[PDB]
Every structure is written in structure tokens, then in C-alpha cells.
Amino acid sequence: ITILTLNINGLNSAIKRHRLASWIKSQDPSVCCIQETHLTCRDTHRLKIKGWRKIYQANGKQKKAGVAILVSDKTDFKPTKIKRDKEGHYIMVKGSIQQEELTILNIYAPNTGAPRFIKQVLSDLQRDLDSHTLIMGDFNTPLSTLDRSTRQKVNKDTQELNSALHQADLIDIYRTLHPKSTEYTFSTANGESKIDHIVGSKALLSKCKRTEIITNYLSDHSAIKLELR
Numbered sequence: 001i002t003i004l005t006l007n008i009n010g011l012n013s014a015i016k017r018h019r020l021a022s023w024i025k026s027q028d029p030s031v032c033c034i035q036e037t038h039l040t041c042r043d044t045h046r047l048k049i050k051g052w053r054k055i056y057q058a059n060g061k062q063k064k065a066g067v068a069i070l071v072s073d074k075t076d077f078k079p080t081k082i083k084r085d086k087e088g089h090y091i092m093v094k095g096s097i098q099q100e101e102l103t104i105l106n107i108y109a110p111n112t113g114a115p116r117f118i119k120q121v122l123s124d125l126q127r128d129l130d131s132h133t134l135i136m137g138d139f140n141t142p143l144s145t146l147d148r149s150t151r152q153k154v155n156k157d158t159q160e161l162n163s164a165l166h167q168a169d170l171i172d173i174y175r176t177l178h179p180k181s182t183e184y185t186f187s188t189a190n191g192e193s194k195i196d197h198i199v200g201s202k203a204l205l206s207k208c209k210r211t212e213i214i215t216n217y218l219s220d221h222s223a224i225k226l227e228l229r
């Protein structure tokens, strides 16, 4: 299967929804984690993509944040649990694909206090984390020195997040498969950073076949795609 993460930078326009649908069809992911749909909980019906009927969403009441997990019609996904943030910053979906269990946590961290935010979500969802977990999305933080063009060491709050990840036997899959990578998923006029991530259970590393970053015209973030046995 293929799993794809993208911060879409809003889906309140028909044109954005159309171009996203075309891009998804082309990429043909089994499961797609989207951040920043900007859809209100009253507007979630607006997200429909032919070929991806099962769409699980977490949304607040304003046109900000918002996350979705889309599952391909060709994927026989059998859900077992879905947990939605009432504020629209994360959604967890658990289930199986051909008798292989998978836990996916789609996260959009705020641009201030991100590593603290992510650490708190991990704590809140501690009982549902497992040895077949993927945590993906826009963490709004580096995880290691090479995740920023500046090469600054990550701060204390980020170190604390990394320790919490380590205690859960979670690793940065991208950086594990590509240790020397100086790729990025976000930029500004003066620098670049890899703030979008695929984190997962140590036990899933054996199933992780390939991962890559995908630049695109849709958003101010590049996507990350993972192929999983």
C-alpha cells in the first residue's frame, strides 16, 4: 500500500477541491492524510473525491485547521476505531487492510508550541499507540538538525518530544531511510525546513519500502509518500 501526507492549505474553493482530486487520482494512494482542509464541522460534506469514498474528518467550528484521512475504494479497509480532535488538529484511524492492522494518526500541530502540542497528543492517545502506528502530518517543527537549512540543533521542547517518541518505540521513518537527507517540505524567502513528517513504530521499518518527497502546485507544503509492504 501507499500512504501519502499533504498539508493542502485549504479546501474551501471548488478549484482547490478539483485540483486535489486530480492530484490524488494521479498519485493513487491507498490512504491519504490531509492537513489544513479549513473546513468547518458543518462543511465536511464538501470534501468528496471519486475513488475515495471513505473520508474521515476532524474539524473545528472556524475555517482553520481541519484534517482528513481518505481511503481508496480499491483498498479493503476495515475500520476499528476513529478518534477526532474536537479542535480539528488531529484524527486517529485504526483498522486493517487484508488482515494487517494499521494505526494512523494524522496531525496538524500549531505553529507556536508545536513540539509541546505533539507531546501532549501522544500522552492523550497513549493507550491507542501500538507497534503498527504511523504518525504523519505537519508537525510544524524539525525533529533533527538536518531538518532545517540553518542546521541548528533542535531545542529543549523538541528534545523532549524525541524522548517521548523513543519511549513509545517510534522513529522518524523518512530520516531512518534517508539519514543524510537535506530535503525540505516548506520554505520561506530566507530558509527551508522539513516540518512535515512520517514517524512510525520501529516494528514497521521492515515493511517500509520507499519514501519520497513530492513537490506540487497545490500548496505551500510538499507531500511525503510512503510505500508499505
Ligand SMILES: [Mn+2]
Pocket (backbone or CB within 6 Å): 009, 036
Ligand atoms: Mn499553513
